[PDB]
Design an enzyme around this catalytic site. Structure first.
Site, mmCIF file in Angstrom:
data_model
loop_
_atom_site.group_PDB
_atom_site.id
_atom_site.type_symbol
_atom_site.label_atom_id
_atom_site.label_comp_id
_atom_site.label_asym_id
_atom_site.label_seq_id
_atom_site.Cartn_x
_atom_site.Cartn_y
_atom_site.Cartn_z
ATOM 1 N N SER A 5 60.782 9.114 -79.561
ATOM 2 C CA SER A 5 61.127 8.495 -80.836
ATOM 3 C C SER A 5 59.948 8.467 -81.803
ATOM 4 O O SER A 5 59.950 7.673 -82.750
ATOM 5 C CB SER A 5 61.661 7.080 -80.613
ATOM 6 O OG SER A 5 60.721 6.290 -79.909
ATOM 7 N N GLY A 6 58.946 9.316 -81.594
ATOM 8 C CA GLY A 6 57.749 9.254 -82.409
ATOM 9 C C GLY A 6 56.733 8.250 -81.918
ATOM 10 O O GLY A 6 56.011 7.662 -82.727
ATOM 11 N N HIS A 21 53.902 8.645 -80.131
ATOM 12 C CA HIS A 21 52.521 9.048 -80.381
ATOM 13 C C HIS A 21 52.189 9.004 -81.866
ATOM 14 O O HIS A 21 51.058 8.676 -82.245
ATOM 15 C CB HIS A 21 52.272 10.440 -79.808
ATOM 16 C CG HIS A 21 52.568 10.547 -78.344
ATOM 17 N ND1 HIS A 21 53.845 10.454 -77.834
ATOM 18 C CD2 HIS A 21 51.750 10.726 -77.280
ATOM 19 C CE1 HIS A 21 53.801 10.577 -76.520
ATOM 20 N NE2 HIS A 21 52.542 10.743 -76.158
ATOM 21 N N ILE A 40 47.589 11.601 -90.486
ATOM 22 C CA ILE A 40 48.811 11.404 -89.715
ATOM 23 C C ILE A 40 49.817 12.516 -89.952
ATOM 24 O O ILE A 40 50.815 12.596 -89.217
ATOM 25 C CB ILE A 40 49.482 10.050 -90.025
ATOM 26 C CG1 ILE A 40 49.968 10.025 -91.474
ATOM 27 C CG2 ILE A 40 48.535 8.896 -89.727
ATOM 28 C CD1 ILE A 40 50.731 8.780 -91.849
ATOM 29 N N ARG A 50 56.502 19.268 -81.281
ATOM 30 C CA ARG A 50 57.484 20.344 -81.326
ATOM 31 C C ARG A 50 57.903 20.690 -82.750
ATOM 32 O O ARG A 50 57.663 21.806 -83.220
ATOM 33 C CB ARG A 50 58.706 19.957 -80.485
ATOM 34 C CG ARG A 50 59.834 20.961 -80.555
ATOM 35 C CD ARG A 50 61.049 20.469 -79.801
ATOM 36 N NE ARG A 50 61.689 19.341 -80.467
ATOM 37 C CZ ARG A 50 62.600 19.463 -81.426
ATOM 38 N NH1 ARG A 50 62.982 20.667 -81.829
ATOM 39 N NH2 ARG A 50 63.131 18.383 -81.979
ATOM 40 N N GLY A 103 58.611 17.624 -85.304
ATOM 41 C CA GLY A 103 58.302 16.515 -86.177
ATOM 42 C C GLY A 103 59.279 16.317 -87.313
ATOM 43 O O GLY A 103 59.048 15.460 -88.166
#
Ligand code: CHD
Ligand code: A3P
EC number: 2.8.2.34
Length: 272
Positions: free
Chosen positions: A40-41, A43, A213, A234, A236
């Protein structure tokens, strides 16, 4: 392995540890936690949190690993190191609400719960869990879909992990975020978390946290440890599920969802 009826990976976790974390691990009012569901994001947000702390300088996050940067309570015997008391304590977790430390619900320590489109989470998980799964033991698309629809995935059903955790969105010490609102509303979300954390920014430091980011910058990033270091970034992109869900699969997902999570679908469900 089903630990307390919850599906975990086959290593890095035990019943004694996860039971000990839920009932007797103690959180201080000064401890911060980053709780998420996988793919789910996780990182991304972690790196955004650290990059605000360093005022945008990515040197720290390049010479570290997310676990060795924000340790994970239920992860192996990490809680033993975590019991060392050092004023502010930054940790992370993936647990659903029923198994999160019962002690936390009576104290007001800060929690950030990140969410993402379950279809994007499904798609992101499918790729990653089949990237380096012993070649042709890699799962086909249909098996994975019906496995996500049932609770048969790590850390439980995405619905119960979310429903339990998002029953606190309007609580004082709870901040609910979406991967979508971080893609669409990127700079004004960092200003909003800075308001929940009292960390303030200068008009130069803002353009630095926001640069490093970006998918491409983060894509070019220390020690590659046991987990996949390169197959994390992969696409994003948001809404890649439309390249994977057949229409019959999108209808089967819409019926399960529109039946399962009945009470919460108002705001934040605005991704479209
Ligand atoms: C090993 C397992 C994936 C197994 C598989 O190929 O299906 C993965 C899936 C989610 C991973 C965890 C999550 O990505 C969250 C953490 C991320 C950190 O970079 C490492 C520890 C960390 C706690 C991870 C440990 C481990 O690599 C996990 C548990
Ligand atoms: N810097 C970044 N910017 C945007 N998306 C990012 C990102 N770092 C990771 N992601 C995306 O976050 C997802 C990984 O989730 P998690 O962190 O929970 O494992 C992946 O999505 P995709 O698989 O759709 O590309 C990855 O591409």
């Amino acid at each position: 392995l089903w630990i307390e009826g919850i599906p975990f990976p086959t290593v890095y976790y035990s019943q004694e540890i996860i039971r000990e974390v839920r009932d007797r691990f103690v959180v201080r009012d000064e401890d911060t936690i980053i709780v998420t569901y996988p793919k789910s994001g996780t990182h991304w947000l972690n790196e955004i949190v650290c990059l605000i702390l360093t005022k945008g300088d990515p040197t720290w996050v390049q010479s570290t690993i997310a676990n060795e940067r924000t340790p994970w309570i239920e992860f192996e015997n990490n809680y033993r190191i975590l019991n060392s008391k050092e004023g502010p304590r930054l940790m992370a977790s993936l647990l659903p609400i029923q198994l999160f430390p019962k002690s936390f619900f009576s104290s007001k320590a800060k929690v950030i719960y990140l969410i993402r489109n379950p279809r994007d989470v499904l798609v992101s998980g499918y790729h990653y869990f089949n990237a380096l799964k012993q070649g042709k033991e890699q799962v086909p698309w249909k098996i994975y879909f019906e496995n996500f629809l049932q609770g048969k995935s790590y850390f439980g059903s995405w619905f119960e992990h979310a429903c339990g955790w998002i029953s606190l969105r309007k609580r004082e010490n709870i901040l609910v975020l979406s991967y979508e609102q971080l893609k669409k509303d990127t700079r004004n979300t960092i200003k909003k978390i800075c308001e929940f954390l009292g960390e303030n920014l200068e008009s130069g430091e803002l353009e630095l946290v926001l640069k490093n980011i970006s998918f491409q910058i983060m894509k070019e990033r220390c020690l590659s440890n046991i987990e996949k270091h390169e197959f994390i970034m992969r696409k994003g992109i948001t809404g890649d599920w439309k390249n994977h869900f057949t229409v019959a699969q999108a209808e089967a997902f819409d019926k399960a969802f529109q039946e399962k999570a009945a009470d919460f679908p108002q705001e934040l469900f605005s991704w479209e």
